[PDB]
Nucleic acid binder design. Structure first.
Ligand code: MG
Ligand code: MG
Ligand code: ZN
Ligand code: ZN
Ligand code: ZN
Ligand code: ZN
Lengths: 162, 162
DNA sequence: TTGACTCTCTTAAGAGAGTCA
DNA sequence: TTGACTCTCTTAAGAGAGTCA
């Protein structure tokens, strides 16, 4: 098993490498009609990505290190959380982008939470629009708003009451 | 089936059958510390379900009718919307439960919207807590709340800014 | 040990279609 | 014609593991 020291060294090498990813300034809605700025550290679009990084899917990457002759591999956004519990309330913990930018590996834009909590941030009104997330959102969710519902509740007859 | 008359006949037959489903009263959060009551028309847990209905998954059903001597079949919650566009913005339209109760087939608890709009209602604060859905929610979403995030954004070094 | 590819899987909101009697 | 089962699929937020040089 990897020791605490070895895990800390993986986290540190990951941070060193991600800290050299291009830093892109994004203007984002915060809710309440306010605009803010996020600084995303974006993995390149194509190889090479950075030492230890490889693309396993269109927007999926992994980080790999060999320690004492054993190959270890992690989801590329999971590395900041290697010293944290991997499950909570029965559910697996997932890396969750507060900036909603998959290529971003800025650990200040990531949290570690259930997939339901992760998904729900997509619709959050944002830190200046009523976010109630205990770990606060950094921006209004990209899918927040009135929606585009095609047809609402309706009946042709009188068989139903709401 | 193809004709408008045939489709209206399908909707009317579906409404008559679902209208005989047991009516279950559910007391629900509305947001803003308020509570309301919904009357769900719940498909039975086991066969028989009702004329034209059959279970294709743990919480999936289908409605089928024989028209022009051929079997026509639909997802059981899609029938109210057979005269509506089946896509929006290039996204598939889905039956979406405003009561978040899959066994319910009350068309006054259903809308027709993209899967993203559908999902997002799970986290809505509700009609008395700030719902901004143009087709308004009937209740606060079951996943609304602070969440249970295990770890928030963090770095070990000084490579990153928010 | 490392890079750059390859493959399939999970979840929870939703689907279509085939086999029998 | 109708009923009661069977199977796999879609999406968009996330995953694990293999091959080859
Ligand atoms: Mg997310
Ligand atoms: Mg829904
Ligand atoms: Zn970011
Ligand atoms: Zn939030
Ligand atoms: Zn209902
Ligand atoms: Zn709503």
């Amino acid at each position: 098993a990897l020791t605490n020291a070895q895990i800390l060294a993986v986290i540190d090498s990951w941070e060193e490498t991600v800290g050299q990813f291009p830093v892109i300034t994004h203007h984002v809605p915060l809710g309440g009609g306010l605009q803010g700025t996020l600084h995303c550290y974006e993995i390149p679009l194509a190889a090479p990505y950075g030492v230890g990084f490889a693309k396993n899917g269109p927007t999926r990457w992994q980080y790999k290190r060999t320690i004492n002759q054993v190959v270890h591999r992690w989801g590329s956004h999971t590395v900041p959380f290697l010293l944290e519990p991997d499950n909570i309330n029965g559910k697996t913990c997932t890396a969750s982008h507060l900036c909603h930018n998959t290529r971003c590996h800025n650990p200040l834009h990531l949290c570690w939470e259930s997939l339901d909590d992760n998904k729900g941030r997509n619709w959050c009104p944002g830190p200046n629009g009523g976010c109630v997330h205990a770990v606060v959102c950094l921006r209004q969710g990209p899918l927040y708003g009135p929606g585009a519902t095609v047809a609402g509740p309706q009946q042709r007859g009188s068989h139903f009451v709401v």
